[PDB]
Amino acid sequence: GLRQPAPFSDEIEVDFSKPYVRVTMEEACRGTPCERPVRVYADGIFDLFHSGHARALMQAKNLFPNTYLIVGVCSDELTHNFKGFTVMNENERYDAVQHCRYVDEVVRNAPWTLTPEFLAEHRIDFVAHDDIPYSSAGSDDVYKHIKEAGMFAPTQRTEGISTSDIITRIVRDYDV
Amino acid sequence: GLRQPAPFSDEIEVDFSKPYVRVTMEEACRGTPCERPVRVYADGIFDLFHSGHARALMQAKNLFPNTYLIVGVCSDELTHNFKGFTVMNENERYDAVQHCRYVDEVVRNAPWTLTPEFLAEHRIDFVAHDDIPYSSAGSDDVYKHIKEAGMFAPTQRTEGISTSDIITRIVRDYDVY
Ligand SMILES: C[N+](C)(C)CCOP(=O)([O-])OP(=O)(O)OC[C@H]1O[C@@H](n2ccc(N)nc2=O)[C@H](O)[C@@H]1O
Ligand SMILES: C[N+](C)(C)CCOP(=O)([O-])OP(=O)(O)OC[C@H]1O[C@@H](n2ccc(N)nc2=O)[C@H](O)[C@@H]1O
């Protein structure tokens, strides 16, 4: 099956000879050549990595018939600054994502807002995340530019599980 | 890489016109034919499934060059009866193990002590778990017979992470009291 964790982006050599040329939704759905998988990026904190996360990564991996899934995971410094507390530290969250079935590669220290430099450096064809506007603010939606450029592929959240729900059962369990 | 969850054991067509014949450690380490991967079984609760669990599965999957890893996950009733409380219910625990990278198959309602019939029905060659005697009790080690029969392949625990440690950090961080 698989035997080794998904590598960090550092451990893979990319041909910078090939220029950054994206595939359209239409070519991506028809199935790209073996050598040229559609490169999908999904980003997250992935704190208390749970099945809600893995299902999202599963959907992003299946967006197209030949897909290579890159998962960016945000550092503690960024997450603390813009969102709040992490139970698991950055190294533990990098590690958990590496053992997910659907992942092909893990970028550490992922950015909060995606930049043209980052998308070009990782040769990203599409970005996958739920469709709810992510406002971390000074912005209404950090994904707005990605949706506007036609590169956004929405996934569905798994109802009935989340980091907050899990923490909440654990504190309820502890109180009673 | 992979696209679909690891299947549950009931979703897989299994040829029984094939006798239960175990491979020895020695044949296992040399590499079995492509069509006869070494079938390794690892069992657990997998509550708040974390990297220590995943690294145990990773080791079990790497024991031999051509390995098929079957992961047994115990039901809530057994766990509550013999070990203690679960944060995740059995369906959530089953599901999480299905998304682990190293798993080929998942057996639900896994037994507490392995029986000859279970080991035969799933055609298990080796059982992987850490080497600390697991006493649930009326036994000193529920893996005792597996060890004596030569089918036990010990994995190493990942230091510094556990279901308990995680619960403990969460209580410090968010509990009102
Ligand atoms: C901070 N960003 C904007 C750079 C990345 C996104 O940050 P986030 O807060 O959505 O991260 P997260 O770790 O909460 O979720 C990562 C991904 O898993 C998904 N997810 C999470 C919980 C859940 N029950 N179902 C899900 O499908 C989210 O929709 C998201 O697509
Ligand atoms: C109940 N049994 C005997 C049928 C199954 C064993 O039950 P358990 O309590 O060892 O289950 P568990 O979910 O705690 O552990 C599952 C597997 O993960 C391993 N594990 C757990 C935590 C950790 N930090 N490192 C690990 O390597 C355990 O050694 C075991 O091999």
Tab-separated table of C-alpha atoms and ligand atoms in Angstrom:
chain	number	residue	atom	x	y	z
A	1	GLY	CA	0.000	0.000	0.000
A	2	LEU	CA	1.962	2.938	1.351
A	3	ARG	CA	4.830	2.462	3.788
A	4	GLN	CA	6.397	5.899	4.346
A	5	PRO	CA	5.075	9.237	5.534
A	6	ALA	CA	4.195	11.898	2.940
A	7	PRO	CA	7.453	13.893	2.400
A	8	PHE	CA	7.882	17.545	3.314
A	9	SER	CA	8.099	19.786	0.214
A	10	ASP	CA	11.850	20.056	0.796
A	11	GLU	CA	12.463	16.405	0.103
A	12	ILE	CA	11.072	16.451	-3.470
A	13	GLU	CA	12.906	17.878	-6.499
A	14	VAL	CA	10.576	19.927	-8.788
A	15	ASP	CA	11.629	20.737	-12.375
A	16	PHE	CA	11.953	24.514	-12.408
A	17	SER	CA	12.791	24.013	-16.087
A	18	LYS	CA	9.061	23.536	-16.790
A	19	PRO	CA	7.423	26.969	-16.489
A	20	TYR	CA	4.393	27.509	-14.203
A	21	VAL	CA	1.487	26.694	-16.603
A	22	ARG	CA	-1.820	25.905	-14.939
A	23	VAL	CA	-4.421	23.498	-16.182
A	24	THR	CA	-7.966	24.628	-16.581
A	25	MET	CA	-10.908	22.934	-14.691
A	26	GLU	CA	-11.932	21.386	-18.029
A	27	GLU	CA	-8.507	19.799	-18.784
A	28	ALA	CA	-8.166	18.762	-15.123
A	29	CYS	CA	-11.505	16.883	-15.181
A	30	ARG	CA	-10.698	15.047	-18.436
A	31	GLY	CA	-7.594	13.546	-16.823
A	32	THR	CA	-4.068	14.888	-17.299
A	33	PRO	CA	-1.102	12.768	-18.498
A	34	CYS	CA	0.550	10.479	-15.978
A	35	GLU	CA	3.590	12.722	-15.724
A	36	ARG	CA	1.493	15.876	-15.113
A	37	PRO	CA	-0.915	15.293	-12.189
A	38	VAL	CA	-3.207	18.211	-11.256
A	39	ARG	CA	-1.568	19.777	-8.245
A	40	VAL	CA	-4.050	20.609	-5.593
A	41	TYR	CA	-3.295	22.540	-2.498
A	42	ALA	CA	-5.352	22.375	0.728
A	43	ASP	CA	-4.269	24.395	3.713
A	44	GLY	CA	-5.228	24.250	7.428
A	45	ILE	CA	-4.114	24.320	11.043
A	46	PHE	CA	-5.035	20.586	11.463
A	47	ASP	CA	-5.073	20.790	15.265
A	48	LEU	CA	-6.154	17.456	16.882
A	49	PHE	CA	-6.061	16.047	13.300
A	50	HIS	CA	-9.468	14.250	13.032
A	51	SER	CA	-11.714	12.610	10.425
A	52	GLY	CA	-13.291	16.013	9.473
A	53	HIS	CA	-9.727	16.981	8.277
A	54	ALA	CA	-9.043	13.673	6.588
A	55	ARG	CA	-12.374	13.708	4.698
A	56	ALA	CA	-11.542	17.213	3.451
A	57	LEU	CA	-8.177	15.955	2.307
A	58	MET	CA	-9.866	12.925	0.796
A	59	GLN	CA	-12.259	15.233	-1.318
A	60	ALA	CA	-9.412	17.424	-2.462
A	61	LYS	CA	-7.393	14.319	-3.613
A	62	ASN	CA	-10.408	13.111	-5.605
A	63	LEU	CA	-11.228	16.406	-7.258
A	64	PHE	CA	-9.672	15.143	-10.511
A	65	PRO	CA	-8.699	11.741	-11.852
A	66	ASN	CA	-4.953	12.298	-11.710
A	67	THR	CA	-4.389	14.543	-8.628
A	68	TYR	CA	-1.288	15.218	-6.495
A	69	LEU	CA	-2.307	16.667	-3.127
A	70	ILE	CA	-0.042	19.170	-1.284
A	71	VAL	CA	-1.126	20.086	2.244
A	72	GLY	CA	0.113	23.364	3.793
A	73	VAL	CA	0.088	23.518	7.580
A	74	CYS	CA	0.416	26.869	9.383
A	75	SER	CA	3.060	27.446	12.036
A	76	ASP	CA	2.160	28.114	15.699
A	77	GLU	CA	3.375	31.721	15.409
A	78	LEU	CA	0.946	32.540	12.522
A	79	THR	CA	-1.939	30.564	14.004
A	80	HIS	CA	-1.564	32.280	17.432
A	81	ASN	CA	-1.338	35.673	15.825
A	82	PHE	CA	-4.383	35.348	13.522
A	83	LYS	CA	-6.759	32.651	14.887
A	84	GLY	CA	-5.983	31.515	18.436
A	85	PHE	CA	-4.562	28.684	20.554
A	86	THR	CA	-3.211	25.324	19.293
A	87	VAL	CA	-3.389	22.149	21.433
A	88	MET	CA	-0.838	20.371	19.226
A	89	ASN	CA	2.390	22.308	18.414
A	90	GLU	CA	3.483	22.852	14.769
A	91	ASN	CA	5.781	19.890	14.692
A	92	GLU	CA	3.112	17.575	15.992
A	93	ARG	CA	0.645	18.915	13.425
A	94	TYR	CA	3.118	18.565	10.544
A	95	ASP	CA	3.720	15.001	11.614
A	96	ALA	CA	-0.002	14.029	11.839
A	97	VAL	CA	-0.714	15.271	8.349
A	98	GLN	CA	2.200	13.204	7.026
A	99	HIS	CA	0.451	10.025	8.142
A	100	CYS	CA	-2.788	10.836	6.363
A	101	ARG	CA	-3.662	8.425	3.496
A	102	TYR	CA	-4.599	11.081	0.888
A	103	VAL	CA	-1.478	13.284	1.125
A	104	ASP	CA	1.322	13.420	-1.358
A	105	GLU	CA	3.372	16.269	0.134
A	106	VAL	CA	3.342	18.603	3.165
A	107	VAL	CA	4.477	22.270	3.142
A	108	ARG	CA	5.397	23.457	6.643
A	109	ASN	CA	5.040	26.968	7.725
A	110	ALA	CA	2.222	27.564	5.250
A	111	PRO	CA	1.146	31.152	4.611
A	112	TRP	CA	-2.098	32.765	5.922
A	113	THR	CA	-3.005	34.379	2.577
A	114	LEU	CA	-1.719	32.755	-0.544
A	115	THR	CA	0.654	34.856	-2.642
A	116	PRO	CA	1.535	34.650	-6.337
A	117	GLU	CA	5.073	33.691	-5.369
A	118	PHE	CA	3.879	30.729	-3.215
A	119	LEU	CA	1.446	29.438	-5.868
A	120	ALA	CA	4.090	29.627	-8.523
A	121	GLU	CA	6.837	28.097	-6.354
A	122	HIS	CA	4.644	25.034	-5.556
A	123	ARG	CA	3.252	24.994	-9.097
A	124	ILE	CA	-0.291	24.926	-7.745
A	125	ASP	CA	-3.196	24.303	-10.072
A	126	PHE	CA	-6.095	24.537	-7.566
A	127	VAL	CA	-6.758	25.444	-3.924
A	128	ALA	CA	-9.207	23.280	-1.870
A	129	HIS	CA	-11.012	24.387	1.257
A	130	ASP	CA	-14.638	24.742	2.402
A	131	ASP	CA	-16.502	27.608	0.726
A	132	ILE	CA	-17.309	29.612	3.832
A	133	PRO	CA	-15.483	32.972	3.494
A	134	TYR	CA	-12.493	32.881	5.773
A	135	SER	CA	-12.174	36.263	7.298
A	136	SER	CA	-9.102	36.896	9.169
A	137	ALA	CA	-9.278	40.407	9.095
A	138	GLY	CA	-8.374	43.291	7.458
A	139	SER	CA	-9.888	40.765	5.162
A	140	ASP	CA	-13.320	39.420	4.575
A	141	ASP	CA	-12.158	36.336	2.731
A	142	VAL	CA	-8.518	35.309	2.531
A	143	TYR	CA	-9.490	33.114	-0.382
A	144	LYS	CA	-11.148	35.955	-2.401
A	145	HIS	CA	-8.302	36.356	-4.903
A	146	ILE	CA	-8.007	32.578	-5.424
A	147	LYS	CA	-11.845	32.362	-6.116
A	148	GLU	CA	-11.690	35.320	-8.465
A	149	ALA	CA	-8.760	33.829	-10.459
A	150	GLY	CA	-10.847	30.610	-11.031
A	151	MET	CA	-8.457	28.434	-8.938
A	152	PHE	CA	-10.769	27.623	-5.992
A	153	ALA	CA	-12.231	24.098	-5.623
A	154	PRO	CA	-14.629	23.995	-2.599
A	155	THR	CA	-14.828	20.914	-0.380
A	156	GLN	CA	-17.604	20.024	2.137
A	157	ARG	CA	-17.075	20.065	5.825
A	158	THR	CA	-17.866	16.899	7.823
A	159	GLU	CA	-20.727	17.649	10.087
A	160	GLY	CA	-20.591	16.549	13.722
A	161	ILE	CA	-16.832	16.687	14.297
A	162	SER	CA	-14.350	19.489	14.892
A	163	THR	CA	-11.352	20.492	17.041
A	164	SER	CA	-13.750	22.593	19.194
A	165	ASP	CA	-16.245	19.721	19.558
A	166	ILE	CA	-13.512	17.337	20.626
A	167	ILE	CA	-12.114	19.787	23.230
A	168	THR	CA	-15.634	20.380	24.457
A	169	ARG	CA	-16.305	16.602	25.029
A	170	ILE	CA	-13.026	16.229	26.806
A	171	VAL	CA	-13.756	19.132	29.214
A	172	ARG	CA	-17.353	17.920	29.742
A	173	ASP	CA	-15.901	14.439	30.474
A	174	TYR	CA	-13.431	15.827	32.910
A	175	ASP	CA	-16.145	17.966	34.751
A	176	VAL	CA	-18.464	14.925	35.110
B	1	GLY	CA	-0.814	7.913	-3.674
B	2	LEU	CA	-4.147	6.619	-2.383
B	3	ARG	CA	-7.649	8.005	-2.924
B	4	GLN	CA	-10.055	5.912	-0.847
B	5	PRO	CA	-10.294	4.935	2.787
B	6	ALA	CA	-8.882	1.561	3.832
B	7	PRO	CA	-11.827	-0.852	3.492
B	8	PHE	CA	-13.522	-2.641	6.387
B	9	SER	CA	-12.720	-6.335	6.460
B	10	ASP	CA	-16.316	-7.300	5.391
B	11	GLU	CA	-15.917	-5.315	2.100
B	12	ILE	CA	-13.119	-7.624	0.873
B	13	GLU	CA	-13.624	-10.908	-1.033
B	14	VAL	CA	-11.466	-13.514	0.744
B	15	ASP	CA	-10.553	-16.885	-0.855
B	16	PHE	CA	-10.941	-19.770	1.721
B	17	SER	CA	-10.193	-22.403	-0.998
B	18	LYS	CA	-6.848	-21.252	0.440
B	19	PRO	CA	-5.827	-23.064	3.692
B	20	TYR	CA	-4.614	-21.040	6.705
B	21	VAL	CA	-0.842	-21.517	6.231
B	22	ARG	CA	1.356	-19.061	8.126
B	23	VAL	CA	4.739	-17.899	6.866
B	24	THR	CA	7.710	-18.037	9.181
B	25	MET	CA	9.741	-14.915	10.222
B	26	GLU	CA	12.508	-16.176	7.997
B	27	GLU	CA	10.344	-16.477	4.802
B	28	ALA	CA	8.580	-13.210	5.827
B	29	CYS	CA	11.900	-11.256	5.989
B	30	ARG	CA	13.141	-12.575	2.625
B	31	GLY	CA	10.028	-11.233	0.831
B	32	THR	CA	6.953	-13.220	-0.109
B	33	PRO	CA	5.546	-13.360	-3.690
B	34	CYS	CA	3.502	-10.303	-4.707
B	35	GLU	CA	0.316	-12.271	-4.387
B	36	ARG	CA	1.029	-13.501	-0.835
B	37	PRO	CA	1.879	-10.407	1.246
B	38	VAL	CA	2.613	-11.093	4.940
B	39	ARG	CA	-0.581	-10.312	6.808
B	40	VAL	CA	0.146	-8.405	9.889
B	41	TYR	CA	-2.341	-7.602	12.493
B	42	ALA	CA	-2.177	-4.621	14.909
B	43	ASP	CA	-4.958	-4.009	17.420
B	44	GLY	CA	-5.852	-0.987	19.624
B	45	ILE	CA	-8.491	1.411	20.882
B	46	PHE	CA	-7.054	4.339	18.852
B	47	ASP	CA	-8.907	6.919	20.908
B	48	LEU	CA	-7.962	10.497	19.765
B	49	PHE	CA	-5.957	8.755	17.046
B	50	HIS	CA	-2.582	10.541	17.079
B	51	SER	CA	0.943	10.171	15.629
B	52	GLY	CA	2.059	7.638	18.256
B	53	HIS	CA	-0.716	5.377	16.897
B	54	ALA	CA	0.166	6.173	13.335
B	55	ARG	CA	3.875	5.482	13.922
B	56	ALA	CA	2.956	2.100	15.498
B	57	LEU	CA	1.002	1.260	12.311
B	58	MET	CA	3.783	2.523	10.173
B	59	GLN	CA	6.279	0.117	11.963
B	60	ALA	CA	3.853	-2.846	11.641
B	61	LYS	CA	3.466	-2.071	7.895
B	62	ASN	CA	7.296	-2.004	7.575
B	63	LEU	CA	8.076	-5.247	9.415
B	64	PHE	CA	8.520	-7.176	6.116
B	65	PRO	CA	9.105	-6.197	2.567
B	66	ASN	CA	5.652	-7.214	1.263
B	67	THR	CA	3.229	-6.570	4.130
B	68	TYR	CA	-0.583	-6.179	4.254
B	69	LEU	CA	-1.672	-4.447	7.424
B	70	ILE	CA	-4.957	-5.248	9.052
B	71	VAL	CA	-5.915	-3.020	11.999
B	72	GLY	CA	-8.423	-4.245	14.650
B	73	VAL	CA	-10.232	-1.591	16.626
B	74	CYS	CA	-12.084	-2.542	19.803
B	75	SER	CA	-15.794	-1.601	20.290
B	76	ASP	CA	-16.922	0.833	22.988
B	77	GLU	CA	-18.533	-1.931	25.079
B	78	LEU	CA	-15.310	-4.041	25.352
B	79	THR	CA	-13.136	-0.973	25.937
B	80	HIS	CA	-15.479	0.370	28.690
B	81	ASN	CA	-15.604	-3.056	30.265
B	82	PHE	CA	-11.858	-3.804	30.291
B	83	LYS	CA	-9.835	-0.524	29.954
B	84	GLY	CA	-11.820	2.656	30.610
B	85	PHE	CA	-13.542	5.597	28.979
B	86	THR	CA	-13.359	6.613	25.287
B	87	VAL	CA	-13.579	10.204	24.049
B	88	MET	CA	-14.310	9.144	20.480
B	89	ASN	CA	-17.086	6.583	19.971
B	90	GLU	CA	-16.386	3.386	18.083
B	91	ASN	CA	-17.605	4.626	14.727
B	92	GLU	CA	-15.404	7.718	14.936
B	93	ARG	CA	-12.438	5.503	15.940
B	94	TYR	CA	-13.104	3.083	13.099
B	95	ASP	CA	-13.291	5.953	10.664
B	96	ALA	CA	-10.031	7.626	11.757
B	97	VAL	CA	-7.983	4.441	11.320
B	98	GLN	CA	-9.445	4.101	7.776
B	99	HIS	CA	-7.706	7.381	6.809
B	100	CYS	CA	-4.316	6.369	8.126
B	101	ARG	CA	-1.677	6.028	5.416
B	102	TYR	CA	-0.253	2.595	6.394
B	103	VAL	CA	-3.515	0.613	6.715
B	104	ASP	CA	-4.754	-1.895	4.240
B	105	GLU	CA	-7.841	-3.196	6.043
B	106	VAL	CA	-9.768	-2.505	9.328
B	107	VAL	CA	-11.639	-5.076	11.405
B	108	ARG	CA	-14.343	-3.518	13.618
B	109	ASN	CA	-15.331	-4.823	17.052
B	110	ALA	CA	-11.824	-6.384	17.398
B	111	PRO	CA	-11.580	-8.977	20.227
B	112	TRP	CA	-9.778	-8.294	23.566
B	113	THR	CA	-7.756	-11.532	23.483
B	114	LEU	CA	-7.009	-13.065	20.159
B	115	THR	CA	-8.518	-16.545	19.578
B	116	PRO	CA	-7.402	-19.239	17.187
B	117	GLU	CA	-10.570	-18.814	15.170
B	118	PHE	CA	-10.082	-15.011	14.735
B	119	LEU	CA	-6.466	-15.509	13.708
B	120	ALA	CA	-7.511	-18.184	11.183
B	121	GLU	CA	-10.626	-16.290	9.825
B	122	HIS	CA	-8.368	-13.221	8.978
B	123	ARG	CA	-5.441	-15.434	7.982
B	124	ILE	CA	-3.045	-13.564	10.262
B	125	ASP	CA	0.669	-14.210	10.017
B	126	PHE	CA	1.960	-11.896	12.804
B	127	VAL	CA	0.509	-9.658	15.557
B	128	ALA	CA	2.178	-6.197	16.133
B	129	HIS	CA	1.923	-4.205	19.308
B	130	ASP	CA	4.434	-2.804	21.839
B	131	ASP	CA	6.226	-5.433	23.992
B	132	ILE	CA	4.856	-4.265	27.426
B	133	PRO	CA	2.738	-7.102	28.935
B	134	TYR	CA	-0.875	-6.115	28.466
B	135	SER	CA	-2.677	-7.209	31.573
B	136	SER	CA	-6.339	-7.089	31.423
B	137	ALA	CA	-6.870	-9.175	33.991
B	138	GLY	CA	-7.299	-12.597	34.819
B	139	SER	CA	-4.359	-12.425	32.522
B	140	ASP	CA	-0.941	-11.050	33.049
B	141	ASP	CA	-0.523	-10.594	29.324
B	142	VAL	CA	-3.336	-11.005	26.797
B	143	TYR	CA	-0.575	-11.377	24.137
B	144	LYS	CA	1.036	-14.245	26.059
B	145	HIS	CA	-0.170	-17.109	23.717
B	146	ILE	CA	0.673	-15.068	20.612
B	147	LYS	CA	4.258	-14.555	21.983
B	148	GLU	CA	4.665	-18.350	22.791
B	149	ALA	CA	3.380	-19.331	19.351
B	150	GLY	CA	6.157	-17.161	17.708
B	151	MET	CA	3.691	-14.819	15.956
B	152	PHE	CA	4.329	-11.627	17.924
B	153	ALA	CA	6.314	-8.846	16.257
B	154	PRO	CA	6.946	-5.998	18.828
B	155	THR	CA	6.659	-2.338	17.808
B	156	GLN	CA	8.149	0.635	19.771
B	157	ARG	CA	6.019	3.318	21.395
B	158	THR	CA	6.416	6.980	20.387
B	159	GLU	CA	7.626	8.813	23.487
B	160	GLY	CA	5.980	12.085	24.408
B	161	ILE	CA	2.489	11.543	22.993
B	162	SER	CA	-0.541	9.657	24.231
B	163	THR	CA	-4.355	9.832	24.466
B	164	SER	CA	-3.805	10.692	28.196
B	165	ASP	CA	-1.250	13.426	27.557
B	166	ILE	CA	-3.558	14.996	24.979
B	167	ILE	CA	-6.598	14.987	27.335
B	168	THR	CA	-4.339	16.438	29.991
B	169	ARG	CA	-3.211	19.399	27.786
B	170	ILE	CA	-6.764	20.073	26.754
B	171	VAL	CA	-8.015	20.189	30.394
B	172	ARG	CA	-5.256	22.666	31.340
B	173	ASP	CA	-6.032	24.850	28.300
B	174	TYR	CA	-9.880	25.085	28.273
B	175	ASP	CA	-11.496	23.621	31.371
B	176	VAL	CA	-13.123	26.433	33.346
B	177	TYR	CA	-12.213	24.954	36.824
C	1	LIG	C1	-5.537	29.473	7.976
C	1	LIG	N1	-5.670	29.183	6.549
C	1	LIG	C2	-6.689	30.100	6.021
C	1	LIG	C3	-4.385	29.454	5.888
C	1	LIG	C4	-5.971	27.775	6.274
C	1	LIG	C5	-7.387	27.288	6.667
C	1	LIG	O1	-7.493	27.266	8.084
C	1	LIG	P1	-8.722	26.527	8.749
C	1	LIG	O2	-8.881	27.361	9.954
C	1	LIG	O3	-9.860	26.266	7.797
C	1	LIG	O4	-8.018	25.117	9.118
C	1	LIG	P2	-8.718	23.820	9.760
C	1	LIG	O5	-7.485	23.070	10.259
C	1	LIG	O6	-9.733	24.305	10.760
C	1	LIG	O7	-9.415	23.047	8.524
C	1	LIG	C6	-8.608	22.596	7.400
C	1	LIG	C7	-9.589	21.968	6.490
C	1	LIG	O8	-10.284	20.821	7.070
C	1	LIG	C8	-11.675	21.105	6.904
C	1	LIG	N2	-12.618	20.561	7.888
C	1	LIG	C9	-12.470	20.849	9.184
C	1	LIG	C10	-13.388	20.358	10.102
C	1	LIG	C11	-14.479	19.613	9.585
C	1	LIG	N3	-15.406	19.072	10.412
C	1	LIG	N4	-14.597	19.327	8.280
C	1	LIG	C12	-13.696	19.826	7.462
C	1	LIG	O9	-13.945	19.522	6.185
C	1	LIG	C13	-11.832	22.609	6.701
C	1	LIG	O10	-13.062	22.874	5.979
C	1	LIG	C14	-10.605	22.989	5.975
C	1	LIG	O11	-10.831	22.738	4.503
C	2	LIG	C1	-7.082	-3.883	23.799
C	2	LIG	N1	-6.233	-4.744	22.959
C	2	LIG	C2	-5.297	-5.507	23.773
C	2	LIG	C3	-7.041	-5.719	22.191
C	2	LIG	C4	-5.536	-3.880	21.981
C	2	LIG	C5	-4.358	-3.072	22.540
C	2	LIG	O1	-4.946	-1.944	23.147
C	2	LIG	P1	-4.069	-0.662	23.567
C	2	LIG	O2	-4.690	-0.248	24.850
C	2	LIG	O3	-2.621	-1.019	23.508
C	2	LIG	O4	-4.477	0.332	22.358
C	2	LIG	P2	-3.907	1.809	22.071
C	2	LIG	O5	-4.971	2.355	21.129
C	2	LIG	O6	-3.548	2.393	23.363
C	2	LIG	O7	-2.560	1.471	21.283
C	2	LIG	C6	-2.574	1.012	19.906
C	2	LIG	C7	-1.153	0.841	19.416
C	2	LIG	O8	-0.521	2.144	19.407
C	2	LIG	C8	0.736	2.069	20.075
C	2	LIG	N2	1.160	3.353	20.629
C	2	LIG	C9	0.348	4.076	21.395
C	2	LIG	C10	0.771	5.312	21.888
C	2	LIG	C11	2.076	5.732	21.591
C	2	LIG	N3	2.559	6.897	22.057
C	2	LIG	N4	2.873	4.983	20.839
C	2	LIG	C12	2.415	3.808	20.358
C	2	LIG	O9	3.281	3.083	19.625
C	2	LIG	C13	0.514	1.024	21.151
C	2	LIG	O10	1.765	0.492	21.529
C	2	LIG	C14	-0.313	0.004	20.395
C	2	LIG	O11	0.562	-0.858	19.626
